[PDB]
């Protein structure tokens, strides 16, 4: 591939290019692009959504909106860096081109920010509690009229691509929906394939999938003005990932392993003991420990570990993408760069702890087992009202709930019943039991 | 049809009939009947109704009572002018018979009073879900051991018909119910026919049905001593309304169109600003344009509006009725009070901005969505219960709920499940569930 | 039977003879089984396990705890008393055994103080609950794959087998349980049957059941050492009740009739008057008068007519023990202690009482039915996830719940449901249900 194309400034419907060298640098689309997400309506819902993590009556613990945020902090420095280098590896991207390190920055902190957007509540629980209502529950009445794939999309719903569904879905006035730029669509797209086939190897880009059957039309327009390489002749389509993706996903990796950690400490699901055993090799370099030690709070403590770890991640995910930059730009690069850590066993044991206190401690798997009841109830209710939309009750659920083909009208329902903050949820999930 | 007939003053199982003219002034039948219903447990029992319009922590909003008593006041003045102009037409009613234009009041008032008494809860929501049940529900196993006549009783279960059984059912130690006189229940009765034929016209008279099967033999005997005409000679029998039963209907429509109005008002529901753009018509004549400004209160401002709209349709109601009276007496008005209101345009703005701020606002909403399951979980119980009577749980349910032929009993079950105060239907509810 | 068999201190898994002669008297097995009950896990759960019996917010209302707690002290006095009596009439147990009064006491004190460890919660509704499961709901799927005995185990589930479980079932690191002597095993066995066949007879002894299928092997070693007499003649095994057996259902019977009655007056569901009025003839001989007229609050009063009753009581049964002891030893004795009192019409009008004013009173029928709820709930959880233990719901149930044959899982199910905390079991229902 080539850079140039890779950094498309086109915007969903476009007629004209979009060259770079003419753009207002107070107006530039990739930055644009950052601010059109923070003040959009689904971002601004991730301030009533938690994560499945607990919360605390004492300390700080991230909700999903402060978690997004710091994830695009972490992938503007990725791509700050990366963009550094890069313009040095190629510097016609520069002084022919017109392209800024900090282009590469905005690209994946956009990206970055917009990566939980379209997730369910309940973590991935909740994504398991949808497909489970189309794969065995009332949904199953459905497969004889979708097509593999078009069912595929519902029993293996899949947050990913209901977040680029919510980027780029029309509505009435408003046509595209964020209208983003294609190389931060392609920075966000971490898995470039549709549901089928399902895991088709042990590629890091083929474990899930990225985009529905209603957005395939899209992801086709942006893998052609990106030029991505393809991975699949047949039908069923699939391509290599956009270079800047591998960014975006080792932003969300170090966030996930290193924040769900601190996260965990103030919570005190994991003790406070375990703190300094566990990132000594990820800090031990750069760690002050007397300032360590003078330090009088638990979260002051945490946190200074929190940093440091961070920009060790950081500093080592840039080297490790300029390292593998010619494989990453051909297409043949089939890890993450996280895979290639020497911190690798430390981040594992990390990982691990988290799962054995955080995810599989009593207060998570409780919040879980209620979200499988809640998700489940609201997308009978929906599909009842869908299948019989003349009765009084239905026009009710309708009315309450939501004032095209199947498999359009079923894909809305799932979009919608995993875009509702907790509270909405919660509320229309008590009038629909009578609580 | 004669209006010596249609005053009567008889009661279930009279045995001597009562002259007009014998009667104590002290103890008129027909103001005993306003006593009697005011005293009555069903009435109390509307003190802990709520109508379905939200409840608001600042302002005023109608309980099902004070609505009742509202309407009944509103009836007593359309009685009342009526009634004096009914014996300057008939004067023959007050020399020969003895009847005064207080009695025309107090029959309208009293049928006015009790018109809601039947109703379930949640409005016409709750209506449907009681039907809903018998169509579609658990009770749907009961169609094939029913009449035609009797199963509509239960798909379309109507609050005037359970209205009717409340006020005449026998009971042990208790013959023919509250004992109303006769053209009291006569102007009760707004649609005089059975559940079958459905709407066979679209006169309002036909719109609903006001007597069930089990309460078929006692409408019968009060047409038969009213001298209501026989509409149909079919085994389905329905009559002409009695000539006050226009006035009780008068009553309704007038406050539930003016009282709607200002109870939005003060909610917040509907703005302020819309008050006396939608009432300007109906006050103009009359409106004491200097107190209306003075009054520095929004809630004193709707009031004064408020009554003078009430006062106009009054006025104009009595007029209409006593335009069509020989047709009314001869039953070939087919048509409302209101509906040849001069003012139609205005009550029909009113209504549907009281639908559109109201009646579809969420409040509505959720709470007829949680009263659906509410009514159908009760419903379920008891017939749970009845089907199986011998089990230990079965037998736990009748001592909480209810400590004859299959008909009667499910009649039973929906009048006492729709006549349950708010909060013991709830906890009974909550009780069953397990919450 | 044989006093010196019936009194023995084999523990489950004995290699050799414990002789009374060689104990500790300050390490009495018999002593050491009452104080392992009250520090074992399931007896410190009776804390936090309520009767069915309302609570009350001005006066006192027995906790399962201090009920068992209660009844304890009551069996101590009992077997203390006959134990005395029975040395006096067989010289050679003190003389050549070692045996001693209050090893009569402790034997009875700790088979009583653990006579409701196993019962589920909501009273003998909470056992109807769990046998209609497997009678009627989700757990009749499972008839066809158990032996007669196993399916009536669960369907008719009782709670006195249960306790007997849960004192004796090995787990790793506790075989055979709290390891308690065998005479107080034997003590404890009111019942000693098992589930078949139903009700063989109208002796007390055959009313219910003792043990389940999965502990026939333990009592039936437990009836061996104690040399109980076999009373079935088929495959069905039935043994003559230990003597001490008697004691600990007099303990019972004289605490549920008397501290039930004190409960139902403190909580004014009994009226105050018919306190002196139905206990006067069981305390007439004893009671001070005017310790009683200057007592000024009624829950002394109460509780010293309580005392009274309590004390005639225990005397009477102990008289009756001595009067039919040899009756007992040939288990031939067809009835209770107390159903030969000779205040057993006064017993009877207390209980009739109490059924009338507590157990049929609408705050107990109310717990009752939502017991129902709450145990079928978590009954059809843990089966569902027994029968598909794959899936992704059923392993987060399986982690929330209960972090072998198909009959030892589905009593196992049945003893941890029944064992649950009110608090817990209430709160894994509501995740459960999305609350």
Redesign the interface.
Same mark, same amino acid.
Do not use: F, M, P, V
């Given at each position: 591939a080539n850079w140039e194309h890779l950094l498309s400034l086109k915007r969903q419907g476009d007629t004209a290019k979009r060259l770079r060298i003419e753009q207002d640098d107070t107006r530039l689309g990739f930055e644009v692009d950052y601010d059109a997400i923070i003040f959009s309506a689904p971002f601004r819902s991730l301030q009533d959504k938690t994560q499945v993590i607990p919360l605390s009556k004492t300390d700080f613990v991230h909700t999903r909106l402060t978690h997004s945020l710091e994830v695009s902090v972490v992938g503007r420095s990725l791509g700050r860096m990366v963009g550094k280098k890069l313009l040095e590896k190629y510097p016609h991207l520069e002084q022919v081109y017109g392209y800024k390190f900090n282009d590469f920055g905005a690209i994946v902190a956009a990206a970055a920010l917009a990566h939980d957007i379209g997730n369910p509540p309940f973590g991935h629980?909740g994504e398991?509690?949808i497909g489970?209502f189309f794969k065995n529950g009332y949904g199953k009445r459905y497969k004889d009229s979708l097509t593999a794939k078009e069912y595929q999309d519902l029993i293996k719903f899949e947050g990913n691509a209901n977040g680029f569904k919510v980027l780029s879905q029309s509505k009435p006035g408003a046509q595209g929906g964020l209208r983003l730029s294609y190389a931060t669509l392609g920075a966000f797209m971490k898995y470039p394939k549709e549901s089928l086939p399902h895991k088709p190897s042990d590629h890091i880009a083929d474990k899930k999938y990225g985009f529905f059957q209603s957005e395939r039309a899209l992801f086709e327009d942006v893998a052609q003005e990106l030029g991505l390489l393809k991975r699949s002749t047949t039908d069923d389509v699939s391509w290599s990932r956009h270079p800047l993706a591998y960014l975006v996903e080792a932003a969300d990796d170090i966030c996930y392993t290193i924040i769900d950690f601190e996260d965990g400490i103030n919570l005190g699901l994991i003790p406070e003991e375990y703190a300094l055993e566990y990132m000594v090799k990820l800090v031990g370099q750069t760690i002050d420990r007397n300032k360590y030690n003078a330090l009088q709070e638990t979260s002051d403590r945490v946190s200074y570990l929190r940093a440091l770890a961070i920009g060790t991640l950081i500093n080592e995910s840039v080297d490790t993408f300029m390292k593998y930059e010619e494989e990453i730009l051909a297409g043949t690069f089939d890890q993450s760069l996280i895979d290639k850590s020497n911190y690798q066993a430390q981040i594992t044991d990390i990982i691990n702890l988290s799962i054995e206190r955080i995810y #599989?401690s =009593?207060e998570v !798997?409780? /919040? &879980? !087992?209620?979200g *499988? &009841? +809640?998700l489940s109830?609201l997308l009978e209710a929906r599909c009842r009202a869908l299948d019989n939309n003349d009765?009084? *009750?239905n026009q %009710? !659920?309708q009315? %309450?709930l939501a004032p095209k083909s199947l498999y359009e009208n079923l894909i809305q329902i799932c979009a919608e019943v995993s875009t509702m903050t907790d509270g909405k949820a919660l =509320? #229309? *999930? /008590? /009038? +629909? /039991?009578? %609580?």
């Open positions: 629980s398991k509690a489970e #599989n =009593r !798997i409780e /919040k &879980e !087992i209620a *499988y &009841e +809640i109830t009765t009084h *009750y %009710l !659920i009315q %309450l =509320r #229309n *999930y /008590k /009038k +629909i /039991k009578g %609580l």
